[PDB]
Amino acid sequence: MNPPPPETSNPNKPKRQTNQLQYLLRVVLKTLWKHQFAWPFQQPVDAVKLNLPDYYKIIKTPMDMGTIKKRLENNYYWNAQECIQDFNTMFTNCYIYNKPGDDIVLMAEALEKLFLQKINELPTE
């Protein structure tokens, strides 16, 4: 069974829009989204459809690019580092639940490499 997905708005949390956050949406997320290995990461893990009822028994801080995209569109984050941490959580969750060599892990590895290439240099404020 599936927990509620992470929040994509929070009215008591202050919003911000920076050149780096705009870039993370327009360039980094939107480019990764098109990768042939992005599809599993475009929405929250559906442990019910995948028939993996232990997924959320192991992963306690779930994240996916669908959530990230909606946060970025909401101006939910204060800075790029906060958003980059949610990408890192998403990749780390994958490596926690799965083992080296697994198809899903090869996909996460590939996207993480592309992610790091793209955030190596960000715009200036």
Ligand SMILES: Cc1cc(CSc2nnc3ccccn23)on1
């Ligand atoms: C492809 C594929 C891999 C799996 C294994 S479960 C899993 N572990 N991390 C993620 C991330 C997204 C979708 C499924 N995930 O299901 N479909």
